[PDB]
């Protein structure tokens, strides 16, 4: 009967959770994400939000964190909200790594995180994480894979997608030009970057602007390794090559 | 207003007074106290021909000896159904013996008003517990507040107010369980909002005598024939 | 510390076609010591039920005053009386509450049926019952059961008439086992009470017994 | 239930309804209704008939017509807040 | 105490002495060993007669509580899971069961065997008490799957009558119970003293 | 410890948010089941997969046991929640009793649940709609369909989800023992029910099907097009 | 008390149990069985305190199919007998310690067969054949003398048959009838009881 | 007014309790009942009401031990509470002392208990009035207990619907109270409900319900037949 | 004794810039044996392991909990466990239940990651982390491992020289230790290699 109370999980008049949609714009709102799936391994591109110049470079990753030997997510959203969902994955890998002394399936560990995200949908009046998530992980059933999961506690297996700012944007491109059984590591890097240049137009995509991390299988083991500035600048350049190539031909033909 | 415990400044609850409401918008199920047993007829709301009819379950067994004809919100009369039968079951194996219904009406309705802020709502779910005791056959109505009485006959749900006008006008105290069912399924019949068909209602006797019984399709035909 | 003192008490339960005997020997050991040799054991639960209840005194007063409360609760719920049965089974259920710290008391319910005919429950400390044409129960079980079994029993014996037992007949088979119990067994002596239930009522005589 | 009979019978008053009109059980069918409710269906119920092409209107448009006023249109009914107020 | 029980292709046979014996002295020799948990099902006690009956009762309100929740009879394979379930969660606490959990079900006629430390077993030939052996040795040598109907009451009541002549805590009578489809029926209780004069 | 009342009656005796909840399901894409002499079929609408996305990952056909399925019409996360709990139950069952589920008691059990949330303290009702597939020991098709509120009903076709309605009216019509004599036919009759609402079949249909206590199996796409396309061929013949 | 024997082979897990129970000096059950199928191709032999068995196994039964059910998944033995260890030491110092003794054979498509060897203390032992019961130490010398890893169906079988047979000739126990499965890429095949008439 | 009445813990601008006077309204719309006590003895008289005329009349008079009753005017549920509590407390007191509870204490306990859920949040008033008589050491003993938990020991009071005219009546006639027997007593219980009683309706054996205690008389309830011959005596208006 | 139920036996060793932990293999129960194969060796990092000896079901769980708790730690700072920090980890962690402990005796030997300095520690079942420059051991025959690492050890000392003396040290202790034994698995941790043997031993 309180007055302040708000309400945070109850039904509206149409059955639309209020907050969590509100989530879902912040989500909308927040920086880009991106991830696309290949044969040979997963990548995930990440627009960052903390291009300031006198804001100093202490991790390894902003947008993205390692769950467990061969999984790591990135987030979008809130970054306190984030940090406390990835410290949750870690701890759920790290319980059924020691309860059955193997790593945790992706699908599970991502089921597990968005039962968390259900029980803070419908449970008490906490408002929810209004934080969105991509996975990459490889495991011994279906390998290489790709999750996205949202604060409402729903989650989707993907080859390629996004989310964040211009999302809808990003994934439309993806669905036109990204190839099934086909586009190994490099192309899906070139793909990533395309994409990110269309998807920040505003800025030319400046390679300390966005944060790559790339998920493969050497030797039995699992590397997960964020592209360095060397091997980001590089891609950047072939793909303003390519475009000029590209824009060198339509004009030509006209 | 705010608040599930409320009172109205003309003396009421809010909360038993919407589930009164609620009551008022289920299915029409009729009890009668007769010498010679209690029957329960209530109407079975068939909403498309592909539900199957047998699957309605609005009259159950509360033990041997006493039977329950729910209407208003079948969910909750479910939970309190298996609140009566936990509570019968522990009567009698506590005391070795059977569960007066005014024993089981009483405890099923002390459960009634305990929700707060456990429940949260009270039950919208309007029963006729009809049995057979030591004292005869006895047919019991409780409702969303509670307060359980024990009727000769009783009519609830949707057409409440015109089947027990019916009620009033046939019931007579010197009568057999067969009339009993005869003007319970006429009643049922003409407040029916569609044909009574013998698949679209169910009926249910308990005699001192024979447990609980729910009449087959062949026994609701027959009676339906008659009327 | 010992939480159990075993404080004597002889109680003695016959049935019948349309009364209920329950004696009790009125006195109260502590080992050795007398102290009362008032206090029976005989407990007037209703109308129709007596119940009597030997061995550790403080569990003999909390089981009937645990019992007396849960009768007044049963008719404050059920608007009625508490029949025999219902009260064998209640006290069953009661003593086996405490299955793991036992009520150190023997009981034995005499009262009268739903139909008006005697009826006997014999408990154990733990609660298993059965309903009994009679039964002793405390210090002389052993020393009264044997001789209900030959008289009102019949055994033993051959070419004999089953003749059921009367009310008299009864009562003094009871007062003569007593004496005996008195006589031979030391926790019996004092008084004997005993508490006759009977379609008109409950009757209470009381008998004098050896003292020492 | 007895006024709701009688809205019922004062809307339906000069309608082309047919033989069997049920009034009581249409009131039954829709309890906590105004009269602005009732006048709705019966229009409806009239509506229905003329959508058919037809001159009478049965026990079968009025059901519909209750369907469409009373609980399709129920998540814009005003009674449930000022019931309260 | 001495009980037994078997299937015989008919059914059901359970049958019990009466004896409660507190020590070197009986309480009584009219003990309803066989205890009726409902028309459908058979418990036998042997060990803490307390805890049986108390137990047992309280198996037969859960399957009471069942066959009401489900329109329908609690499998006798159910019935003995449930009893062990309960007995096992106060395990090592004091408890002292031997029961024979005896019905028909969908799955023919069902016997079980289960106690206090939880040994819920199926089985066609069991007995549990004092005189648990000396009816396993007669039964076992006069037991057959193909055996008739007074044939299997014979059985059982020579061999609960072998165990109360050797077993000394194991006397009284000599209940006897068939359970079949339709139920269970007590053929006969005759005392032990008749049974040797008719030997 | 949040303890406030979610779901209270209005003034007219109504639970508006278990009536919400109802919304959720009536906005949540279609599921279409029914039940045949010995096949219980039960397809749903995949409701715009894309290219990119794994089909594997979205369930909304779960098995709950080796004979029980479940077919969902809601809001996805309230689906996984409901299946889980009700897998968790189907195992606690089997070892209670050493019998599987039957579809009745499993579709009991999620009824009690959804009541639960509907008047538990600071828990919204699940907005789902289930239709609970399966066959008992007996060898017995059943379908049931349980909603928000908790109401179970056992019936012989369903569709719950956007096109709810208008499939049920089309599986009123058209269903019968000689359009369900055989498993190929109870397929047909399940597709074109879905064709009545989803504008294009194939890529927006998923069947699942299970024959008598076989297993669950999930028609593959090119079967899917295959029944499609002899449906096609018996539409224009009669045409 | 009972008796459990596990023979690996390159391709298969074959494992075998005694199928008496008994109370007392006396058995009440002569085809007592005490394989639980944990999955399609996870096996489980129990022994040890009467009803812990039971419960333990019934309950990492269930948890083992609710696994199954929630992923479309089937537990590997090893994560299946991982899972069996970590439960048997959380339950170990409490209130409820299971005394069971275990050996859970399984075959992995990948892994291939598995066998392992775990006491009422929670202690894996991925073994290419073990024993348990108070048989176990007259049998594992036998096994360990006749035994070869590249040792095949016929000759495993065989190898279990006269070792159950020395079980026969020495161990006190009336042990007349052992229940025989093997866990194979094909599931698990159920083969005659060697029995001693 | 609208938004000084939805909790129990808000006070009016006017020092007032909406939610209280609301119970106790609930407990004026309660049916009447009438208790009266004398040198001896004590009578509560309840005029019970039928909801519907198939149903049979709601009883109103309750035990709660061998020396004490009450008639209940309100919730019916809340009063199948408070009569639990009652009850409990009544045997707690017998265990512990081997005494009847004085009503006196009882009625002390019923107060605190019906005051807690008063000043806490989210929790309402018992909405059921009580008229408890009974008889104890210091003779008998008329109470009326109030939704509000303040309670007020009465030699006679009237509560429920119309229970305004029972008052008048028992003002009247409290001089000839104390010192007429129990048959004149009751009379006067039931004179008291005639008075409420509309002047086209009148008792009946079916419609009162007469629960008496006193000296060497544990509470007893008459109704139905029981109470014909209390009626018997009564005169005409 | 609670340590003879399944007896172990592990130590270790430093030399210039490079250590050794060596493990007996068995895990038979009593006098019995049950496998040969049984692992005490858990690697905790690239040149940090853990020996944990004494009852079989104790050494797999700290072995487990050891291994979540360092995955955690390592997870939430991006850095790899000094050897120090993961000695008072276990440390705490047999700690944590004192009243009810794990009844193993780890062995700690690894190198700093940064300056590969040589480090070797012990904890007892209550959590007593004592670092040394010399020896660690832990196990059953503790006193015949202590006896020849302290008559046969030579201070600064290289890589293969250390290999030999923790071989020898190892296979005289539990030849004379009986109830473990039966195969010693040593492994020698240098700044760039993980050097693991498997050598042998009176099999009775």
Same mark, same amino acid.
């Given at each position: 009967s309180?007055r302040?109370?708000?309400?945070?999980?109850i039904?509206?008049?149409?059955?639309r959770?209020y907050q969590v949609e509100y989530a879902?714009?912040?989500?909308?709102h927040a920086?880009?994400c991106?991830?696309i799936?290949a044969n040979?391994?997963?990548?995930?591109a990440?627009?960052?939000?903390?291009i300031h110049?006198?804001?100093?470079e202490?991790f390894?990753s902003?947008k993205?964190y390692?769950l467990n030997?061969?999984?790591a997510?990135?987030?979008?959203?809130?970054?306190?909200?984030?940090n406390?969902l990835?410290?949750?994955?870690?701890?759920?890998?790290?319980?059924?790594?020691?309860?059955y002394?193997?790593?945790?399936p992706?699908?599970?560990?991502?089921?597990?995180?968005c039962d968390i995200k259900q029980?803070?949908t419908?449970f008490?009046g906490?408002?929810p994480?209004?934080?969105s998530l991509?996975?990459i992980?490889?495991?011994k059933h279906?390998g290489?894979q790709?999750?996205?999961?949202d604060?409402?506690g729903?989650?989707?297996?993907?080859?390629a997608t996004?989310?964040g700012?211009?999302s809808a944007?990003?994934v439309s491109?993806?669905?036109?030009?990204?190839?099934?059984g086909?586009?190994?590591?490099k192309?899906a890097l070139?793909?990533?970057?395309?994409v990110l240049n269309?998807t920040?137009?505003?800025?030319?995509?400046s390679?300390e602007?966005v944060?790559?991390?790339t998920?493969?299988?050497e030797?039995?083991?699992?590397v997960?390794?964020v592209?360095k500035?060397?091997?980001?600048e590089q891609?950047?350049?072939k793909?303003?090559?390519?475009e000029?190539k590209?824009?060198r031909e339509?004009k030509?033909?006209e | 207003?705010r608040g599930?415990?409320?009172?109205?400044?003309?003396?009421?609850l809010?909360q038993?007074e919407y589930?009164?409401?609620a009551?008022?918008?289920?299915?029409?199920?009729?009890g009668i106290?007769?010498?010679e047993?209690?029957?329960l007829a209530?109407?079975?709301?068939?909403?498309?021909p592909?539900?199957?009819?047998?699957?309605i379950?609005k009259?159950?067994e509360?033990?041997?000896?006493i039977?329950?004809?729910?209407?208003?919100?079948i969910?909750?009369?479910?939970t309190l159904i298996?609140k009566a039968?936990?509570?019968?079951?522990?009567?009698?194996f506590?005391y070795?013996?059977?569960?007066?219904?005014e024993?089981?009406?009483q405890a099923?309705?002390?459960?009634a008003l305990?929700?707060?802020?456990a429940?949260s709502?009270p039950?919208g779910?309007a029963?006729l517990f009809?049995?057979?005791d030591?004292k005869?056959?006895?047919l019991?109505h409780m409702?969303?507040?509670?307060?359980f009485?024990?009727?000769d006959?009783?009519?609830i749900?949707?057409?409440?107010?015109?089947a027990?006008?019916s009620?009033?006008?046939?019931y007579?105290?010197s009568m057999?369980?067969k009339?009993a069912?005869?003007?319970?399924?006429?009643?049922?019949?003409q407040?029916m909002?569609?044909?009574?068909?013998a698949t679209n209602?169910?009926?249910?006797?308990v005699?001192p005598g024979?447990n609980?019984?729910?009449?087959?399709?062949?026994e609701l035909?027959?009676?339906?024939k008659d009327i | 510390f010992?939480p159990y003192?075993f404080?004597?008490?002889?109680?003695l339960?016959?049935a019948g076609?349309?009364?209920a005997?329950v004696?009790?020997?009125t006195?109260?050991?502590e080992g050795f010591?007398?102290?009362?040799?008032?206090?029976?054991?005989?407990?007037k639960?209703?109308?129709?039920?007596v119940?009597?209840?030997?061995?550790?005194?403080?569990?003999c007063?909390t089981?009937t005053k645990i019992i007396?409360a849960?009768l007044?609760?049963?008719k404050?719920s059920?608007?009625?009386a508490?029949?025999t049965?219902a009260?064998?089974?209640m006290l069953?259920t009661?003593?086996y509450?405490?299955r793991f710290?036992?009520?150190?008391?023997y009981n034995?319910?005499?009262?009268l049926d739903?139909e008006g005919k005697g009826?006997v429950y014999?408990?154990?400390?733990?609660g298993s019952?059965q309903?009994?044409?009679?039964?002793?129960?405390?210090s002389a079980?052993a020393?009264?059961q044997?001789?209900?079994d030959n008289?009102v029993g019949?055994?033993?014996?051959?070419?004999v008439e089953?003749?059921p037992?009367?009310?008299?007949?009864?009562?003094?088979?009871?007062?003569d086992?007593f004496?005996?119990?008195?006589?031979?067994?030391?926790?019996?002596?004092?008084?004997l009470?005993?508490?006759i239930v009977?379609?008109?009522?409950?009757?209470?005589e009381?008998?004098?017994?050896?003292?020492? | 239930?007895?006024?709701?009979?009688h809205?019922?019978?004062i809307?339906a008053?000069?309608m082309?309804?047919?033989?069997?009109?049920r009034?009581?059980?249409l009131?039954r069918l829709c309890p906590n209704?105004t009269?602005?409710e009732?006048?709705?269906?019966?229009t409806?119920?009239g509506?229905?008939?003329?959508?058919?092409?037809?001159?009478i209107?049965?026990?079968?448009d009025?059901?519909e017509?209750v369907?469409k006023?009373i609980?399709?249109y129920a998540?814009f009914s005003?009674?449930?807040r000022?019931?309260?107020y | 105490?001495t009980?037994?029980?078997?299937k015989?292709?008919?059914?059901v046979i359970?049958?019990a002495?009466?004896r409660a014996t507190?020590?070197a002295?009986?309480?009584?020799?009219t003990?309803?060993?066989?205890?009726?948990?409902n028309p459908?099902?058979?418990g036998?006690?042997a060990?803490?007669?307390?805890?049986?009956?108390?137990?047992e009762?309280?198996?037969?309100?859960?399957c009471?509580?069942?066959e009401?929740?489900?329109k329908?009879?609690?499998?006798v394979?159910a019935?003995?899971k449930l009893?062990?379930?309960?007995?096992?969660?106060?395990k090592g606490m004091?408890?002292?069961m031997?029961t024979?959990?005896?019905?028909?079900?969908?799955?023919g006629?069902?016997?079980y065997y289960?106690d206090?430390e939880?040994?819920?077993i199926?089985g066609?030939?069991?007995?549990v008490?004092?005189?648990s052996?000396?009816?396993?040795?007669?039964?076992?040598?006069?037991?057959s799957?193909?055996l008739e109907?007074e044939?299997?009451?014979?059985? !059982?009541r020579?061999?609960?009558?072998?165990?109360?002549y050797?077993? !000394?805590?194991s006397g009284?009578?000599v209940n006897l119970?068939?359970?079949?489809e339709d139920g269970?029926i007590?053929?006969?209780?005759d005392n032990?003293?008749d049974?040797?004069?008719?030997? | 410890?949040?303890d406030?009342?979610?779901?209270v009656?209005s003034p007219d005796?109504?639970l508006?948010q278990?009536?919400?909840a109802?919304?959720?399901?009536?906005?949540?894409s279609?599921?279409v089941?029914v039940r045949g002499r010995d096949?219980?079929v039960?397809?749903?609408?995949?409701?715009?997969?894309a290219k990119l996305?794994?089909e594997?990952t979205?369930?909304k056909?779960?098995?709950?046991?080796?004979n029980?399925?479940m077919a969902?019409a809601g809001?996805?996360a309230?689906a996984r929640?409901?299946?889980?709990?009700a897998?968790?139950?189907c195992?606690?069952?089997r070892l209670?009793v050493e019998?599987p589920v039957?579809?009745?008691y499993i579709?009991?059990?999620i009824?009690?649940?959804?009541?639960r949330?509907?008047?538990?303290n600071?828990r919204?009702?699940?907005g789902?709609?289930?239709?609970?597939?399966?066959?008992?020991?007996?060898g017995?098709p059943?379908?049931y369909q349980?909603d928000p509120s908790?109401?179970?009903?056992?019936?012989?076709?369903?569709?719950i989800?956007?096109?709810?309605?208008?499939?049920?009216e089309?599986?009123?019509?058209?269903?019968?023992?000689?359009?369900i004599?055989?498993?190929?036919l109870?397929?047909?009759?399940?597709?074109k029910?879905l064709?009545?609402?989803?504008?294009?079949?194939?890529?927006?249909?998923?069947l699942?099907?299970?024959?008598?206590?076989?297993?669950?199996?999930?028609?593959?796409?090119?079967?899917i097009?295959k029944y499609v396309a002899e449906?096609?061929?018996?539409?224009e013949?009669?045409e | 008390?009972?008796?459990?024997?596990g023979i690996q082979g390159?391709?298969?897990v074959?494992?075998a149990?005694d199928r008496?129970?008994?109370?007392?000096?006396?058995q009440?059950?002569?085809?007592?069985?005490k394989?639980?199928?944990?999955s399609?191709?996870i096996?489980?032999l129990c022994?040890?305190e009467?009803?812990?068995?039971?419960?333990?196994?019934e309950?990492?039964?269930?948890?083992v199919?609710?696994y199954?059910?929630?992923?479309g998944?089937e537990?590997s033995?090893?994560?299946?007998?991982?899972?069996?260890r970590?439960?048997?030491?959380?339950?170990?110092?409490?209130?409820?310690?299971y005394?069971?003794?275990?050996l859970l054979?399984?075959?992995?498509?990948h892994?291939g067969?598995?066998?392992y060897?775990?006491?009422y203390?929670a202690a894996?032992?991925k073994?290419?054949?073990?024993?348990?019961?108070?048989?176990?130490?007259?049998?594992?010398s036998?096994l360990?003398?006749?035994?070869?890893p590249?040792i095949?169906?016929?000759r495993?079988?065989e190898?279990l048959?006269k070792?159950?047979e020395?079980?026969?000739?020495?161990?006190?126990?009336?042990l007349?009838?052992?229940?025989?499965?093997?866990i194979d890429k094909?599931?698990?095949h159920?083969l005659?009881n060697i029995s001693?008439? | 007014?609208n938004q000084y009445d939805?909790?129990?813990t808000?006070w009016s601008?006017?020092?007032? $309790?909406?939610q209280?006077?609301?119970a106790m309204?609930?407990?004026?719309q309660?049916?009447?009942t009438?208790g009266?006590k004398?040198?001896?003895?004590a009578?509560?008289?309840a005029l019970?009401r039928?909801?519907?005329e198939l149903a049979?009349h709601?009883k109103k008079?309750?035990?709660?031990?061998?020396?004490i009753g009450?008639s $209940?005017?309100?919730?019916?549920?809340?009063?199948?509470?408070?009569?639990?509590?009652?009850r409990q407390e009544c045997?707690?007191?017998r265990?512990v002392?081997?005494?009847?509870?004085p009503?006196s204490?009882l009625?002390?306990l019923?107060?605190s208990?019906?005051?807690?859920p008063t000043?806490?949040?989210?929790?309402?008033?018992?909405?059921?009035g009580?008229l408890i008589?009974?008889?104890?050491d210091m003779g008998?003993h008329i109470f009326?207990?109030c939704?509000?938990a303040?309670?007020?020991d009465?030699?006679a009071m009237? $509560?429920g619907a119309?229970?305004?005219?029972a008052?008048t009546?028992?003002?009247?006639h409290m001089?000839?109270?104390m010192?007429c027997?129990?048959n004149?007593?009751?009379?006067?219980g039931?004179?008291?409900?005639?008075?409420?009683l509309?002047a086209?309706?009148d008792?009946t054996?079916?419609?009162v319900?007469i629960g $008496?205690?006193g000296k060497?008389?544990?509470?007893?309830?008459?109704?139905?037949?029981d109470?014909?011959p209390?009626?018997?005596?009564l005169?005409?208006? | 004794s609670?340590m003879s139920?399944?007896?172990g036996?592990v130590?270790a060793?430093?030399?210039k810039?490079?250590v050794?932990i060596?493990?007996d293999?068995?895990?038979?129960?009593?006098?019995?044996?049950v496998?040969?194969d049984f692992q005490?060796?858990?690697?905790?990092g690239?040149?940090?392991y853990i020996?944990l000896?004494?009852?079989?079901?104790?050494?797999?769980?700290?072995?487990?909990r050891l291994?979540?708790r360092?995955?955690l730690?390592?997870?939430k700072?991006?850095?790899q466990?000094?050897?120090?920090?993961?000695?008072?980890?276990?440390?705490?962690?047999?700690?944590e239940k004192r009243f009810?402990?794990?009844?193993?005796?780890p062995?700690?030997?690894?190198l700093?990651?940064?300056?590969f300095?040589p480090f070797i520690?012990?904890?007892?079942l209550?959590?007593?982390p004592m670092?040394?420059?010399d020896?660690v051991?832990?196990?059953?025959?503790?006193?015949?491992?202590?006896?020849?690492?302290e008559s046969?050890?030579?201070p600064?000392?290289?890589?293969?020289?250390?290999?030999?003396?923790?071989?020898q040290?190892?296979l005289n202790?539990?030849?004379?230790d009986a109830?473990?034994?039966?195969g010693v698995?040593?492994?020698?941790?240098e700044?760039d290699k993980?050097?693991?043997?498997?050598?042998?031993?009176?099999?009775?």
């Amino acid at each position: 009967s309180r007055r302040y109370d708000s309400r945070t999980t109850i039904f509206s008049p149409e059955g639309r959770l209020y907050q969590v949609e509100y989530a879902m714009e912040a989500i909308g709102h927040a920086g880009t994400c991106l991830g696309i799936l290949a044969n040979d391994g997963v990548l995930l591109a990440a627009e960052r939000r903390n291009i300031h110049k006198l804001l100093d470079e202490v991790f390894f990753s902003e947008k993205i964190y390692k769950l467990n030997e061969d999984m790591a997510c990135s987030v979008a959203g809130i970054t306190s909200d984030a940090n406390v969902l990835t410290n949750e994955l870690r701890l759920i890998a790290q319980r059924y790594l020691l309860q059955y002394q193997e790593p945790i399936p992706c699908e599970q560990l991502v089921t597990a995180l968005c039962d968390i995200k259900q029980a803070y949908t419908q449970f008490g009046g906490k408002r929810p994480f209004g934080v969105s998530l991509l996975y990459i992980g490889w495991d011994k059933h279906y390998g290489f894979q790709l999750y996205q999961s949202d604060p409402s506690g729903n989650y989707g297996g993907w080859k390629a997608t996004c989310i964040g700012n211009n999302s809808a944007a990003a994934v439309s491109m993806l669905k036109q030009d990204y190839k099934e059984g086909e586009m190994t590591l490099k192309s899906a890097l070139a793909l990533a970057i395309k994409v990110l240049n269309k998807t920040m137009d505003v800025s030319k995509l400046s390679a300390e602007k966005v944060e790559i991390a790339t998920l493969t299988r050497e030797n039995g083991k699992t590397v997960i390794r964020v592209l360095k500035q060397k091997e980001v600048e590089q891609l950047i350049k072939k793909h303003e090559e390519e475009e000029a190539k590209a824009e060198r031909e339509k004009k030509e033909k006209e | 207003d705010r608040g599930v415990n409320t009172f109205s400044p003309e003396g009421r609850l809010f909360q038993v007074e919407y589930a009164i409401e609620a009551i008022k918008l289920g299915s029409t199920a009729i009890g009668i106290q007769t010498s010679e047993g209690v029957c329960l007829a209530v109407e079975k709301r068939i909403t498309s021909p592909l539900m199957e009819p047998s699957s309605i379950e609005k009259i159950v067994e509360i033990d041997a000896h006493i039977g329950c004809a729910m209407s208003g919100l079948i969910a909750d009369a479910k939970t309190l159904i298996d609140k009566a039968r936990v509570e019968t079951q522990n009567h009698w194996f506590t005391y070795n013996e059977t569960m007066t219904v005014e024993s089981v009406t009483q405890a099923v309705s002390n459960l009634a008003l305990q929700f707060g802020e456990a429940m949260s709502r009270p039950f919208g779910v309007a029963l006729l517990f009809g049995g057979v005791d030591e004292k005869g056959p006895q047919l019991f109505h409780m409702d969303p507040s509670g307060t359980f009485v024990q009727c000769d006959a009783r009519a609830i749900g949707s057409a409440s107010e015109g089947a027990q006008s019916s009620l009033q006008e046939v019931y007579h105290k010197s009568m057999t369980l067969k009339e009993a069912i005869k003007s319970s399924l006429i009643i049922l019949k003409q407040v029916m909002e569609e044909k009574l068909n013998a698949t679209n209602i169910e009926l249910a006797t308990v005699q001192p005598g024979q447990n609980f019984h729910m009449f087959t399709k062949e026994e609701l035909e027959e009676v339906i024939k008659d009327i | 510390f010992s939480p159990y003192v075993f404080n004597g008490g002889t109680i003695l339960a016959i049935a019948g076609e349309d009364f209920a005997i329950v004696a009790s020997d009125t006195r109260l050991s502590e080992g050795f010591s007398i102290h009362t040799r008032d206090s029976p054991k005989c407990y007037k639960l209703t109308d129709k039920t007596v119940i009597g209840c030997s061995g550790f005194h403080g569990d003999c007063l909390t089981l009937t005053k645990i019992i007396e409360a849960r009768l007044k609760m049963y008719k404050h719920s059920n608007n009625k009386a508490m029949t025999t049965g219902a009260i064998a089974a209640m006290l069953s259920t009661i003593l086996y509450s405490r299955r793991f710290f036992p009520y150190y008391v023997y009981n034995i319910i005499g009262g009268l049926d739903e139909e008006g005919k005697g009826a006997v429950y014999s408990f154990d400390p733990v609660g298993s019952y059965q309903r009994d044409s009679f039964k002793a129960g405390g210090s002389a079980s052993a020393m009264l059961q044997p001789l209900l079994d030959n008289q009102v029993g019949f055994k033993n014996m051959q070419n004999v008439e089953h003749v059921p037992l009367s009310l008299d007949r009864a009562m003094r088979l009871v007062k003569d086992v007593f004496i005996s119990a008195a006589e031979r067994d030391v926790y019996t002596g004092d008084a004997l009470r005993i508490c006759i239930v009977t379609k008109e009522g409950i009757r209470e005589e009381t008998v004098s017994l050896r003292k020492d | 239930l007895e006024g709701r009979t009688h809205i019922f019978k004062i809307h339906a008053r000069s309608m082309s309804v047919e033989r069997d009109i049920r009034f009581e059980l249409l009131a039954r069918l829709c309890p906590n209704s105004t009269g602005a409710e009732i006048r709705s269906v019966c229009t409806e119920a009239g509506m229905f008939a003329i959508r058919a092409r037809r001159k009478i209107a049965t026990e079968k448009d009025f059901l519909e017509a209750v369907n469409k006023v009373i609980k399709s249109y129920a998540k814009f009914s005003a009674t449930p807040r000022y019931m309260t107020y | 105490t001495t009980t037994l029980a078997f299937k015989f292709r008919h059914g059901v046979i359970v049958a019990a002495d009466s004896r409660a014996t507190a020590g070197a002295y009986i309480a009584s020799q009219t003990v309803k060993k066989v205890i009726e948990i409902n028309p459908y099902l058979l418990g036998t006690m042997a060990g803490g007669a307390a805890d049986c009956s108390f137990w047992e009762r309280l198996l037969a309100r859960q399957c009471r509580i069942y066959e009401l929740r489900n329109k329908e009879r609690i499998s006798v394979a159910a019935a003995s899971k449930l009893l062990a379930n309960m007995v096992y969660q106060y395990k090592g606490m004091g408890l002292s069961m031997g029961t024979m959990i005896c019905g028909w079900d969908k799955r023919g006629p069902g016997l079980y065997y289960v106690d206090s430390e939880g040994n819920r077993i199926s089985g066609a030939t069991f007995s549990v008490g004092s005189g648990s052996v000396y009816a396993y040795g007669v039964m076992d040598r006069g037991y057959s799957y193909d055996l008739e109907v007074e044939q299997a009451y014979d059985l !059982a009541r020579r061999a609960i009558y072998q165990a109360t002549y050797r077993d !000394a805590y194991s006397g009284g009578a000599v209940n006897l119970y068939h359970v079949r489809e339709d139920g269970w029926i007590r053929v006969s209780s005759d005392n032990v003293a008749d049974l040797h004069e008719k030997y | 410890s949040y303890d406030r009342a979610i779901t209270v009656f209005s003034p007219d005796g109504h639970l508006f948010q278990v009536e919400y909840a109802q919304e959720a399901v009536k906005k949540g894409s279609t599921a279409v089941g029914v039940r045949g002499r010995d096949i219980v079929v039960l397809g749903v609408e995949k409701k715009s997969v894309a290219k990119l996305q794994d089909e594997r990952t979205v369930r909304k056909i779960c098995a709950l046991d080796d004979n029980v399925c479940m077919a969902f019409a809601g809001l996805t996360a309230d689906a996984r929640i409901v299946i889980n709990r009700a897998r968790v139950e189907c195992q606690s069952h089997r070892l209670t009793v050493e019998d599987p589920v039957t579809v009745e008691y499993i579709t009991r059990y999620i009824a009690s649940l959804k009541q639960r949330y509907t008047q538990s303290n600071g828990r919204r009702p699940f907005g789902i709609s289930a239709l609970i597939v399966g066959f008992d020991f007996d060898g017995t098709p059943r379908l049931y369909q349980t909603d928000p509120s908790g109401t179970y009903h056992a019936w012989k076709a369903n569709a719950i989800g956007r096109g709810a309605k208008s499939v049920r009216e089309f599986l009123e019509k058209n269903y019968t023992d000689e359009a369900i004599e055989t498993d190929d036919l109870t397929i047909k009759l399940v597709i074109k029910a879905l064709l009545e609402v989803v504008q294009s079949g194939g890529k927006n249909i998923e069947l699942a099907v299970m024959r008598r206590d076989q297993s669950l199996k999930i028609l593959n796409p090119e079967e899917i097009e295959k029944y499609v396309a002899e449906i096609e061929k018996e539409k224009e013949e009669n045409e | 008390m009972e008796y459990l024997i596990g023979i690996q082979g390159p391709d298969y897990v074959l494992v075998a149990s005694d199928r008496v129970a008994a109370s007392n000096i006396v058995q009440m059950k002569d085809d007592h069985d005490k394989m639980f199928k944990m999955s399609e191709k996870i096996l489980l032999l129990c022994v040890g305190e009467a009803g812990d068995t039971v419960q333990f196994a019934e309950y990492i039964q269930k948890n083992v199919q609710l696994y199954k059910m929630r992923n479309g998944y089937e537990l590997s033995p090893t994560a299946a007998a991982n899972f069996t260890r970590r439960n048997l030491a959380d339950c170990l110092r409490s209130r409820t310690p299971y005394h069971v003794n275990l050996l859970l054979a399984g075959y992995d498509e990948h892994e291939g067969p598995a066998l392992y060897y775990m006491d009422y203390l929670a202690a894996l032992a991925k073994a290419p054949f073990a024993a348990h019961g108070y048989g176990a130490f007259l049998t594992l010398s036998i096994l360990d003398r006749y035994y070869t890893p590249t040792i095949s169906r016929e000759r495993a079988v065989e190898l279990l048959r006269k070792c159950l047979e020395e079980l026969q000739k020495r161990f006190i126990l009336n042990l007349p009838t052992f229940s025989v499965r093997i866990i194979d890429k094909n599931g698990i095949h159920d083969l005659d009881n060697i029995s001693f008439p | 007014r609208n938004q000084y009445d939805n909790d129990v813990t808000v006070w009016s601008p006017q020092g007032r $309790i909406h939610q209280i006077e609301y119970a106790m309204e609930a407990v004026k719309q309660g049916s009447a009942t009438v208790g009266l006590k004398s040198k001896t003895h004590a009578v509560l008289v309840a005029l019970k009401r039928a909801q519907s005329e198939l149903a049979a009349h709601q009883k109103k008079i309750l035990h709660v031990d061998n020396h004490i009753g009450i008639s $209940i005017a309100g919730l019916t549920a809340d009063a199948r509470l408070l009569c639990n509590f009652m009850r409990q407390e009544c045997l707690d007191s017998r265990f512990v002392f081997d005494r009847p509870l004085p009503v006196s204490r009882l009625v002390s306990l019923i107060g605190s208990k019906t005051q807690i859920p008063t000043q806490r949040y989210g929790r309402r008033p018992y909405g059921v009035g009580l008229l408890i008589a009974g008889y104890d050491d210091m003779g008998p003993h008329i109470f009326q207990t109030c939704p509000s938990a303040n309670y007020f020991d009465c030699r006679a009071m009237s $509560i429920g619907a119309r229970s305004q005219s029972a008052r008048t009546y028992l003002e009247r006639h409290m001089s000839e109270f104390m010192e007429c027997n129990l048959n004149e007593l009751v009379k006067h219980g039931l004179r008291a409900l005639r008075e409420t009683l509309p002047a086209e309706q009148d008792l009946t054996t079916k419609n009162v319900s007469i629960g $008496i205690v006193g000296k060497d008389l544990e509470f007893t309830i008459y109704d139905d037949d029981d109470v014909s011959p209390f009626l018997e005596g009564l005169e005409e208006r | 004794s609670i340590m003879s139920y399944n007896g172990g036996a592990v130590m270790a060793m430093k030399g210039k810039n490079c250590v050794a932990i060596a493990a007996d293999r068995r895990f038979g129960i009593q006098a019995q044996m049950v496998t040969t194969d049984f692992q005490k060796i858990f690697p905790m990092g690239d040149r940090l392991y853990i020996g944990l000896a004494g009852l079989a079901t104790d050494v797999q769980t700290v072995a487990q909990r050891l291994k979540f708790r360092l995955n955690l730690y390592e997870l939430k700072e991006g850095r790899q466990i000094k050897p120090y920090t993961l000695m008072s980890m276990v440390a705490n962690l047999l700690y944590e239940k004192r009243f009810g402990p794990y009844y193993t005796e780890p062995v700690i030997a690894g190198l700093d990651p940064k300056t590969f300095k040589p480090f070797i520690c012990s904890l007892d079942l209550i959590g007593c982390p004592m670092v040394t420059d010399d020896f660690v051991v832990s196990g059953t025959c503790a006193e015949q491992m202590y006896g020849m690492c302290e008559s046969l050890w030579e201070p600064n000392m290289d890589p293969d020289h250390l290999f030999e003396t923790i071989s020898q040290a190892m296979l005289n202790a539990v030849d004379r230790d009986a109830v473990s034994g039966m195969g010693v698995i040593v492994h020698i941790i240098e700044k760039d290699k993980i050097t693991t043997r498997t050598l042998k031993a009176r099999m009775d």
